[PDB]
Amino acid sequence: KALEVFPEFAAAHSNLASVLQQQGKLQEALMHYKEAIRISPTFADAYSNMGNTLKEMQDVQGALQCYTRAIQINPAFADAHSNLASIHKDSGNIPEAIASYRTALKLKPDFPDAYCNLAHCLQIVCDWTDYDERMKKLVSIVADQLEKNRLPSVHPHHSMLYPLSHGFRKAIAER
Amino acid sequence: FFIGDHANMFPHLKKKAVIDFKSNGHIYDNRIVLNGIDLKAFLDSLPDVKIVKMKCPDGGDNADSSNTALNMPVIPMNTIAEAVIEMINRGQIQITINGFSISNGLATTQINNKAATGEEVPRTIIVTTRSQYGLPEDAIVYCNFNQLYKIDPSTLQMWANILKRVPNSVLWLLRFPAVGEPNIQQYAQNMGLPQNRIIFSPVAPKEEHVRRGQLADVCLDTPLCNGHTTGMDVLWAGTPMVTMPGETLASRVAASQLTCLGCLELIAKNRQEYEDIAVKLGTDLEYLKKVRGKVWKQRISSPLFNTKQYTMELERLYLQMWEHYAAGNKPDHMIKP
Amino acid sequence: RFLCGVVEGFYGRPWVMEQRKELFRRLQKWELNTYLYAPKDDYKHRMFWREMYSVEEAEQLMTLISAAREYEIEFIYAISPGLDITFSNPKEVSTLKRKLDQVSQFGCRSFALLFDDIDHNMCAADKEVFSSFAHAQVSITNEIYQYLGEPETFLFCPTEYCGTFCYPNVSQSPYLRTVGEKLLPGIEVLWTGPKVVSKEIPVESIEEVSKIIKRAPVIWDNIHANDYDQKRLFLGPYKGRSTELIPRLKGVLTNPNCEFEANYVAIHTLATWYKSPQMALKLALTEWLQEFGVPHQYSSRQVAHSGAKASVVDGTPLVAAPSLNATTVVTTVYQ
Numbered sequence A: 001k002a003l004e005v006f007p008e009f010a011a012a013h014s015n016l017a018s019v020l021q022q023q024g025k026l027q028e029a030l031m032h033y034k035e036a037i038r039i040s041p042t043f044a045d046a047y048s049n050m051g052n053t054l055k056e057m058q059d060v061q062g063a064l065q066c067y068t069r070a071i072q073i074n075p076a077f078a079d080a081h082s083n084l085a086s087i088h089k090d091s092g093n094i095p096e097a098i099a100s101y102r103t104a105l106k107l108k109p110d111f112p113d114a115y116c117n118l119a120h121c122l123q124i125v126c127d128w129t130d131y132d133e134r135m136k137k138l139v140s141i142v143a144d145q146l147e148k149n150r151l152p153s154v155h156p157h158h159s160m161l162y163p164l165s166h167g168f169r170k171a172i173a174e175r
Numbered sequence B: 001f002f003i004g005d006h007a008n009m010f011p012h013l014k015k016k017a018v019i020d021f022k023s024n025g026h027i028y029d030n031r032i033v034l035n036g037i038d039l040k041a042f043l044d045s046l047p048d049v050k051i052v053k054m055k056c057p058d059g060g061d062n063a064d065s066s067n068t069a070l071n072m073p074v075i076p077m078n079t080i081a082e083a084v085i086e087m088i089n090r091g092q093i094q095i096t097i098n099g100f101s102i103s104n105g106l107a108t109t110q111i112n113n114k115a116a117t118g119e120e121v122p123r124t125i126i127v128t129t130r131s132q133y134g135l136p137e138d139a140i141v142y143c144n145f146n147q148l149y150k151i152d153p154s155t156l157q158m159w160a161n162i163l164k165r166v167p168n169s170v171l172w173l174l175r176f177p178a179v180g181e182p183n184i185q186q187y188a189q190n191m192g193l194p195q196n197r198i199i200f201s202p203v204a205p206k207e208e209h210v211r212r213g214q215l216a217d218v219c220l221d222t223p224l225c226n227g228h229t230t231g232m233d234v235l236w237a238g239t240p241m242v243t244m245p246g247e248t249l250a251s252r253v254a255a256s257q258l259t260c261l262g263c264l265e266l267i268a269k270n271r272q273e274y275e276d277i278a279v280k281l282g283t284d285l286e287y288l289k290k291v292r293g294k295v296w297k298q299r300i301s302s303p304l305f306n307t308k309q310y311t312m313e314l315e316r317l318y319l320q321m322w323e324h325y326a327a328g329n330k331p332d333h334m335i336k337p
Numbered sequence C: 001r002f003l004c005g006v007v008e009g010f011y012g013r014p015w016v017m018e019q020r021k022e023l024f025r026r027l028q029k030w031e032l033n034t035y036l037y038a039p040k041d042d043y044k045h046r047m048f049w050r051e052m053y054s055v056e057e058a059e060q061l062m063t064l065i066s067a068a069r070e071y072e073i074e075f076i077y078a079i080s081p082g083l084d085i086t087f088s089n090p091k092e093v094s095t096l097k098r099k100l101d102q103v104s105q106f107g108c109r110s111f112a113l114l115f116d117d118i119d120h121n122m123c124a125a126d127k128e129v130f131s132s133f134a135h136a137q138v139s140i141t142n143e144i145y146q147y148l149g150e151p152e153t154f155l156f157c158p159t160e161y162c163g164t165f166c167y168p169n170v171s172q173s174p175y176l177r178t179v180g181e182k183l184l185p186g187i188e189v190l191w192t193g194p195k196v197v198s199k200e201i202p203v204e205s206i207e208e209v210s211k212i213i214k215r216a217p218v219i220w221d222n223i224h225a226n227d228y229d230q231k232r233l234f235l236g237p238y239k240g241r242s243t244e245l246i247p248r249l250k251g252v253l254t255n256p257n258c259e260f261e262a263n264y265v266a267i268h269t270l271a272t273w274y275k276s277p278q279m280a281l282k283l284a285l286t287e288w289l290q291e292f293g294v295p296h297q298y299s300s301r302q303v304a305h306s307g308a309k310a311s312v313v314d315g316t317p318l319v320a321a322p323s324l325n326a327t328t329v330v331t332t333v334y335q
């Protein structure tokens, strides 16, 4: 209704594409993101989301360069740093992925999922600096996401490689 | 619940042999070794053969028969022996001696990439040498092959204790990932080990990734998350491993293969006696003989690698699920079938 | 002259003369005709294309044009103006032209203006005086083209170069239409496949892009390139075209990766098989052994394992409604 009423509404395209991504069907979602970008050049959020999809069906690091576009349009957008670092760690280029995670976290002091992913990457390269406190803070944030009770920051596979309660990991798997 | 798969696609590892080492007569098996499906066929081509039975605790019984896979064929050195030694020194890929194709392991990929990964069997006689991965030919080499992330400060302190308490030893690491090796190095000297006490090797295709395990003496294991596939790889080569089961399933995993190995002594209940077992192995210098000989002997007889019994038992378990559920019986703890 | 070569557009300070020298030797001795410089490690001059070169880096450019001379491979310089440029300030156009003259009498004869990865927020005055980014961009593009005496080779990097950015489809791209129209064939446009991972399956897509750009496109061969992925390698023989693509293309410009000689053998397979895939695989096997550079027994990092998958974030925006802003007044409305 909003679109037929206002055939140049950008945020409406964005939300519609978001739910279509939630609907799993993507071609129309990708198209909606595309048209939203056309009608609004500086909509870095739509870059972030369209890259999210564009790697979600299967990786095209065109999603990565899209993340970079969103980055350079406004570097304050930490989520794009997080996503591109995630793509890097998917590729296996762990160091600069760690660098980008570390950046994004220092841009916004408290960002749970990015921080736990960074912790996983660090433990991959075995950087045991701040070890115990890293463990305790990640336990804290996963506990926090567990009684607020939606999606856990730590991935289930990473979970048991941490000292978390069997109840905690059971809850994460359930979630 | 963990199936042995290496009994099929890597049958060439079933046998073992060494040429006469440069050490005067003494048997330090895992420095330069011989393997291959046709290695037995090479026994005739040996101008001088040497056979000594692998004297596991039988007492003259059960072992005086042939037991070709359960002895040592060692060839007293020849001029051709030095030729293949300096082969591995200088590194020509492979040649043929008396119709038997001798190939250095480190480059077997160039024989057949399809056989390199393990899809095809390395197809000729394969010789490997400790020095080709820079290893002290006359030391004690503990090993570990898993990904580097399943190691923590506490476990590093464990193996540093074991290493200090056994000075004449080196620990086998893998630059896997490559970048984390200096990162763990700094931790290694920061608590006081020089840059010689640990030797870290590059990633390889599986067939070499598991063949190189033979050259090590004893495998050190990660209690934080044991090596599921990697540990079993180490088993199939015949090199033993010692672990402390934790509480997570993975922490329990390493002990499962060892229980199927039928020898609890490699399973640890606490950190300190885990230290004790590792050092007892590395210091006895006789107990390695028993453990490795028996693992090599009954690894094939171990109920793990032979997929027959596992296949029938899993099929019977499928019978149990259907004969439980299909009668309307609700799902339950399905125990002692 | 069919363009085929390597771009130093990826990471890297201008390295030793020996590494680049072996590069140029493998270019010339194995028929690679094209080489570019626009590294993402352009120290600061990628955005400060405005910045004059000190005689020191100018003399390293002398070294570069030299090497491109004795090894005869046409070096092309190329810089990105679309980040801090304004299309209504002909002073700044003169800045670009003076820079081009500097590096041109420096020996360079070919240039590309990189309009990718640019700002998208142009001055409003520019917005009404120049309709879209495409129109002002191609206007100054033809301006440079005439200014350099219509150089025979003059590459070009557009703002939209992939399937993602040909809004919304190639057939419906106003930007690309204007690029094709206002351009003259003296400028050679770059474009990287219907997917950024240019697994060039569609010949018909090549025809469509050709006709909407009114020329045979030039493929900025980034499939190897760490400009978007370094580990993405062709394990098998090189691909990304067919025989019928030969007339429909004008150039292939690849960006290599740390497996240097692997990139070399891939591109020379492309060069030979240009003038059928499995013999390149045969040459891949052949020139892998002749390589002996970074063999790793085929088993460098990225070996299979039990890897997890990453997780990613996004939210939803709200909207507002603007109220009235009128501001008018009268004096005598009554009778």
Ligand SMILES: O=c1ccn([C@@H]2O[C@H](COP(=O)(O)OP(=O)(O)O)[C@@H](O)[C@H]2O)c(=O)[nH]1
Binding pocket: B145, B146, B147, B174, B176, B202, B203, B204, B205, B206, B209, B226, B227, B228, B229, B230, B231, B233, C303, C304, C305, C306, C307
């Ligand atoms: O140099 C190496 C390192 C690893 N692997 C293989 O990688 C796997 C181990 O990694 P992963 O963590 O996925 O398995 P796990 O260690 O959990 O059993 C096994 O299949 C090994 O054979 C290998 O072949 N060579």
